[PDB]
Coordinates of C-alpha atoms and ligand atoms in Angstrom, one line a residue:
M1 CA -18.0 -0.6 14.9
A2 CA -20.4 -0.7 12.0
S3 CA -18.7 -1.2 8.6
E4 CA -19.8 0.3 5.3
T5 CA -19.7 -1.7 2.0
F6 CA -19.1 -0.4 -1.5
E7 CA -18.9 -1.9 -4.9
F8 CA -15.7 -1.5 -6.9
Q9 CA -15.9 0.5 -10.2
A10 CA -16.4 -2.2 -12.9
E11 CA -13.1 -1.5 -14.5
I12 CA -11.1 -1.5 -11.3
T13 CA -12.5 -5.0 -10.7
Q14 CA -11.5 -6.0 -14.2
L15 CA -8.0 -4.8 -13.6
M16 CA -7.8 -6.7 -10.2
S17 CA -8.8 -9.9 -12.1
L18 CA -6.3 -9.3 -14.9
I19 CA -3.8 -8.9 -12.1
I20 CA -4.6 -11.9 -9.9
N21 CA -5.1 -14.1 -13.0
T22 CA -3.3 -12.8 -16.1
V23 CA 0.3 -11.9 -15.1
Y24 CA 2.8 -14.6 -13.9
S25 CA 6.4 -13.7 -13.3
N26 CA 8.2 -10.6 -11.9
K27 CA 5.8 -10.3 -9.0
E28 CA 8.4 -8.6 -6.9
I29 CA 7.5 -5.3 -8.5
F30 CA 4.6 -4.8 -6.1
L31 CA 7.2 -3.6 -3.6
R32 CA 8.6 -0.7 -5.6
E33 CA 5.0 0.3 -6.4
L34 CA 4.1 0.5 -2.8
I35 CA 7.3 2.1 -1.8
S36 CA 6.8 4.6 -4.6
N37 CA 3.4 5.5 -3.3
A38 CA 4.8 5.8 0.2
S39 CA 7.3 8.3 -1.1
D40 CA 4.7 10.2 -3.2
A41 CA 2.6 10.6 0.0
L42 CA 5.6 11.6 2.1
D43 CA 6.4 14.2 -0.6
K44 CA 2.9 15.8 -0.2
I45 CA 3.2 16.1 3.6
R46 CA 6.7 17.6 3.3
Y47 CA 5.4 20.1 0.7
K48 CA 2.3 21.1 2.7
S49 CA 4.4 21.5 5.8
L50 CA 6.4 24.3 4.1
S51 CA 3.6 26.7 4.6
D52 CA 1.9 24.8 7.4
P53 CA 4.7 23.5 9.8
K54 CA 2.0 22.4 12.3
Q55 CA 1.0 19.6 9.9
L56 CA 4.1 17.7 10.9
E57 CA 3.6 17.7 14.7
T58 CA 1.2 14.7 14.6
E59 CA 4.2 12.7 13.3
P60 CA 7.5 14.7 13.1
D61 CA 9.4 11.9 11.5
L62 CA 9.2 11.2 7.7
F63 CA 10.0 7.5 6.9
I64 CA 9.0 4.3 5.1
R65 CA 8.8 1.2 7.2
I66 CA 8.3 -2.4 6.2
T67 CA 7.3 -5.0 8.8
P68 CA 7.3 -8.8 8.1
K69 CA 4.9 -10.7 10.4
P70 CA 5.6 -14.5 9.8
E71 CA 3.0 -15.8 12.2
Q72 CA 0.0 -14.2 10.5
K73 CA 1.6 -14.4 7.1
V74 CA 1.4 -10.6 6.8
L75 CA 3.7 -8.0 5.2
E76 CA 3.0 -4.4 6.2
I77 CA 4.3 -1.3 4.5
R78 CA 4.0 2.0 6.5
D79 CA 4.7 5.6 5.7
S80 CA 4.2 8.9 7.6
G81 CA 2.9 10.6 4.5
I82 CA -0.1 12.9 4.2
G83 CA -2.7 10.1 5.0
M84 CA -6.2 9.6 3.7
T85 CA -9.6 10.6 5.1
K86 CA -12.6 8.3 4.8
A87 CA -13.9 10.0 1.7
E88 CA -10.5 9.7 -0.1
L89 CA -10.2 6.0 0.9
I90 CA -13.6 5.6 -0.8
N91 CA -12.8 7.7 -3.9
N92 CA -9.1 6.9 -4.4
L93 CA -9.4 3.1 -3.8
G94 CA -12.6 1.9 -5.5
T95 CA -15.7 3.9 -6.3
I96 CA -14.0 6.2 -8.8
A97 CA -12.1 4.7 -11.7
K98 CA -8.9 6.8 -11.9
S99 CA -8.1 7.8 -15.5
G100 CA -5.9 5.1 -17.1
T101 CA -7.4 2.1 -15.3
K102 CA -8.8 0.8 -18.6
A103 CA -5.8 2.1 -20.6
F104 CA -3.4 -0.1 -18.7
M105 CA -5.6 -3.1 -19.1
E106 CA -5.4 -2.5 -22.8
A107 CA -1.7 -1.8 -22.8
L108 CA -1.2 -4.9 -20.7
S109 CA -3.1 -7.0 -23.3
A110 CA -1.3 -5.6 -26.3
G111 CA 1.9 -7.1 -24.7
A112 CA 3.0 -4.6 -22.1
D113 CA 5.3 -5.1 -19.1
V114 CA 3.2 -5.3 -16.0
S115 CA 6.0 -3.2 -14.4
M116 CA 4.6 -0.3 -16.4
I117 CA 1.5 -0.3 -14.2
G118 CA 2.8 2.7 -12.3
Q119 CA 3.1 4.9 -15.4
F120 CA -0.7 4.4 -15.7
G121 CA -0.9 5.5 -12.1
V122 CA -2.5 2.2 -10.9
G123 CA 0.5 0.7 -9.1
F124 CA -1.6 0.2 -5.9
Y125 CA -3.3 -2.8 -7.4
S126 CA -0.1 -4.6 -8.3
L127 CA -0.1 -5.8 -4.6
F128 CA -2.6 -8.4 -5.6
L129 CA 0.3 -10.2 -7.4
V130 CA 1.4 -11.5 -4.0
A131 CA -1.7 -10.9 -1.7
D132 CA -5.3 -12.0 -1.9
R133 CA -6.6 -9.8 1.0
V134 CA -5.5 -6.2 1.9
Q135 CA -6.1 -3.8 4.7
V136 CA -5.4 -0.1 4.2
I137 CA -5.1 1.7 7.5
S138 CA -5.0 5.4 7.2
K139 CA -4.8 8.5 9.4
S140 CA -5.2 12.0 8.0
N141 CA -4.7 15.2 10.0
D142 CA -8.3 16.0 9.0
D143 CA -10.1 12.8 10.0
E144 CA -10.1 9.8 12.3
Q145 CA -8.1 6.6 11.6
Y146 CA -9.9 4.2 9.3
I147 CA -9.6 0.8 7.7
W148 CA -10.2 0.1 4.1
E149 CA -10.4 -3.6 3.2
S150 CA -10.6 -5.6 0.0
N151 CA -10.4 -9.4 -0.4
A152 CA -10.1 -9.1 -4.2
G153 CA -13.9 -9.5 -4.4
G154 CA -16.2 -7.1 -6.1
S155 CA -16.7 -4.9 -3.0
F156 CA -14.7 -3.3 -0.2
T157 CA -15.4 -1.9 3.3
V158 CA -14.5 1.1 5.4
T159 CA -14.6 0.9 9.2
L160 CA -13.6 3.5 11.9
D161 CA -10.4 2.1 13.3
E162 CA -10.7 1.0 16.9
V163 CA -8.6 -2.2 16.7
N164 CA -5.2 -1.2 15.2
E165 CA -2.4 0.7 16.8
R166 CA -2.5 4.5 16.5
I167 CA -0.5 5.8 13.6
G168 CA 0.2 9.5 14.1
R169 CA -0.1 10.3 10.4
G170 CA 0.1 8.3 7.2
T171 CA -0.9 4.9 6.0
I172 CA -0.3 1.2 6.6
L173 CA -0.7 -1.5 3.9
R174 CA -1.4 -4.8 5.6
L175 CA -1.0 -7.3 2.9
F176 CA -2.2 -10.8 3.7
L177 CA 0.3 -12.9 1.6
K178 CA -0.5 -15.9 -0.5
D179 CA 0.9 -19.3 0.7
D180 CA 3.1 -19.3 -2.4
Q181 CA 4.4 -15.8 -1.9
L182 CA 5.7 -16.0 1.6
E183 CA 9.3 -15.4 0.6
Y184 CA 8.5 -11.7 1.2
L185 CA 8.5 -12.2 4.9
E186 CA 12.2 -12.9 4.6
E187 CA 14.8 -10.2 5.6
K188 CA 17.1 -11.1 2.7
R189 CA 14.6 -11.2 -0.1
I190 CA 12.9 -8.0 0.9
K191 CA 16.3 -6.3 1.4
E192 CA 17.3 -7.5 -2.1
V193 CA 14.3 -6.2 -3.9
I194 CA 14.6 -2.9 -2.2
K195 CA 18.2 -2.3 -3.1
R196 CA 17.8 -3.4 -6.8
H197 CA 14.7 -1.4 -7.6
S198 CA 14.4 1.4 -5.0
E199 CA 17.8 3.2 -5.1
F200 CA 16.6 6.8 -5.5
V201 CA 14.2 7.2 -2.6
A202 CA 14.4 10.4 -0.6
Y203 CA 13.2 8.8 2.7
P204 CA 14.6 6.4 5.3
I205 CA 13.4 2.9 4.4
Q206 CA 13.3 1.0 7.7
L207 CA 13.2 -2.8 7.9
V208 CA 11.7 -4.2 11.1
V209 CA 13.2 -7.5 12.1
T210 CA 12.3 -9.9 14.9
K211 CA 15.0 -12.3 16.2
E212 CA 15.0 -14.6 19.1
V213 CA 17.8 -14.2 21.6
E214 CA 19.9 -17.3 22.0
Ligands
NP5_301 O1 -3.5 7.6 -3.7 C1 -2.7 6.9 -3.1 C2 -1.3 6.6 -3.8 C3 -0.2 7.6 -3.5 C4 -0.4 9.0 -4.1 C5 -0.8 9.9 -2.9 C6 -2.1 10.0 -2.6 C7 -2.5 10.9 -1.5 C8 -2.4 10.0 -0.2 O2 -2.2 8.7 -0.7 C9 -1.8 7.8 0.3 O3 -1.9 8.1 1.5 C10 -1.2 6.4 -0.1 C11 -0.1 5.9 0.6 O4 0.5 6.6 1.6 C12 0.4 4.7 0.2 C13 -0.1 4.0 -0.8 O5 0.4 2.8 -1.2 C14 -1.3 4.5 -1.5 CL1 -2.0 3.7 -2.7 C15 -1.8 5.7 -1.1 C16 -3.0 6.3 -1.8

């Protein structure tokens, strides 16, 4: 598959740098940000399905699912929400600087809690606290499955998905964790963070665990 390359909006890049380099502690917050988005996307499919029940048939179950993958140092966060089409992947995750991107960078500088990122509607980028490379794998009812990829550089890429498993509907966040952030592949740590900061979530939050049989 041919891949297409795009430059990040100049302030989105700034922000990613202020994230990767400016904030230190409380990096566990990336999880609630990515669970929050998962819920906000599941909300939209559940709303749309009220007047278009057929929207749900491509994936009748509404859930949030986290999968630790120790071997490839990867943490994945899936939902069966509304999904994103190629154009939205492009617009919502790079080319267009969502209103508030610069505002949070300013807030942050004046002395703001990095945990307030979500209230500026930029929570997505908080993932770079624990990861240096990310794959966003989406499937909308109205397009094929695609892969959006950023390595924290200045650009990103979108490629028709012919390599990943078929998600019926929704999105997968394949975070490639930093060597010093691998505690998030642990069942207990994840399970902790989730209970402390994600109590009021309307959807099933499944944790996928792999254990050798003795
Ligand atoms: O804009 C996004 C943030 C959520 C608000 C809903 C947008 C419409 C679809 O959005 C998504 O599929 C989606 C998701 O499922 C999980 C995520 O972590 C992110 Cl970032 C997104 C993209």
